[PDB]
């Protein structure tokens, strides 16, 4: 449905923050991961116009720029059944990011935001956008468990070593 549309390569490398940045306690990882997905889905100008402004027109009510619009976006994410026409337009974007040409480089960095920044600390209770965008990049959706484990205690030998 959005055929004839493409993106420029490596469009998001300036946007992904440092690892010491995302180890912050005042780091609301939602609006900076979406801000990566916003920049990563910036359509290349080689796409023709009538598919460009439609796909951009789908974006502004899905991935807004202002911090009050995305905070307003989460408000209907609690009752996504009662908002079908925006909920139905979301899986279109999920279909687009499924065929994204740098999907693996996204999917490598997408769950790098999940562990180091704690993006997926709800694990099944995250809202509708962070659910399917990760499910757009991670096919099996196996991100539910796995970042929580960190191999806490094991001492196969001697005590403190000096």
């Amino acid at each position: 449905p959005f055929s004839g549309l493409k993106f420029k390569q490596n469009s998001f490398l300036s946007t992904v923050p440092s690892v010491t940045n995302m180890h912050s306690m005042h780091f609301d990882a939602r609006e900076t991961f979406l801000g990566v997905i916003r920049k990563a889905l910036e359509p290349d100008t080689s796409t023709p116009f009538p598919v460009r402004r439609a796909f951009d027109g789908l974006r502004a009510e899905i991935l807004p720029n202002d911090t009050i619009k995305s905070a307003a976006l989460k408000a209907q994410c609690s009752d996504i059944d009662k908002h079908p026409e925006l909920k139905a337009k979301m899986e279109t974007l999920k279909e687009v990011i499924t065929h994204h040409p740098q999907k693996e480089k996204l999917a490598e960095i997408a769950l790098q935001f999940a562990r180091e920044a704690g993006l997926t600390r709800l694990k099944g209770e995250t809202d509708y956008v962070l659910s399917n965008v990760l499910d757009g990049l991670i096919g099996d959706g196996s991100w539910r468990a796995g970042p929580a484990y960190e191999s806490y205690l094991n001492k196969p030998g001697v005590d403190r070593v000096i």
Partner: protein
Amino acid sequence: TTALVCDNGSGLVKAGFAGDDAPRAVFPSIVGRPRHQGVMVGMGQKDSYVGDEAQSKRGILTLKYPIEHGIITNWDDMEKIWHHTFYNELRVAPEEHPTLLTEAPLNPKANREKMTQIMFETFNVPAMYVAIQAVLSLYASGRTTGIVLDSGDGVTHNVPIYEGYALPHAIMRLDLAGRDLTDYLMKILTERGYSFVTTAEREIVRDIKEKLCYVALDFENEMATAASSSSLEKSYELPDGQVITIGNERFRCPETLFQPSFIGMESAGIHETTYNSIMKCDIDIRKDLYANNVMSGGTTMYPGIADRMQKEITALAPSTMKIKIIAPPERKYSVWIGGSILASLSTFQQMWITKQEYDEAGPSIVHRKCF
């Protein structure tokens, strides 16, 4: 009622009202995300500094520019800087005053189409207009003819223009500019060991450059003065306190404008692409372009740049007739000031791009408004 004029500078966003002599606020075009822990609980907010507050706090930020080479790249950040212009530092409602964006010639179309689409559908300004950089600078001259060496932070370009009429085929444009100066100055400080690596130090390299670097009148004979290095070196205090000094690297950096092979780009220097522009122009105008050369843009605030190109174009011109280099003392703001004039003309209020004619036109309306 009044109009705003806001030169989208590649390095320094210059902005202000129409009819004002000086631009109201000039701040560097820097957006910056922080890059560290933030173990404080209160000061961890404001996750993206922009402008002067990113300039002062530059030690903990990854300073990135939204515009490179005159082409607006990061449109998400470019909203953030324009929101900082209108609300945060001009304190004006953008929906009430008309704006006037400015841009370089020969940039991509989508740099212009997105720029108007992000102006109406985000800021809802009543009317806008996009101007070529150098054709504003003749309004700053108060003179209707002559080419312009408009060298900015991101791009340099020549727009030859006779009285009224421009020469669109003879517009030449080189991407060598102040960032390519700054990046080459970073390369040659390492020869003296002053290794300045990251973006915070890339900022203070420009403070070295704008305070110290002059361009030489005769490059080789003044290089030979640096052989008997007696009085060439000055010395600059870094923000930490330790001091540097710099010798032949002080003038060898702005010779990139004249020998672009120093940064290895295969081109003619800005003295020669001047003459290559005037040779492209028709033969009657060439007498008047030689008498009318407007230096413009903040890169051309190097001391000695007027005395150099007046010498060097004379080497290329036929020597039977005179050359002039019109270098005013307001070259840094010349694009804005000419932009401040053009919005104030009574014959201009029909030349805008209104919203009521935008809505049936779409973003291609600016291509039928002065190309």
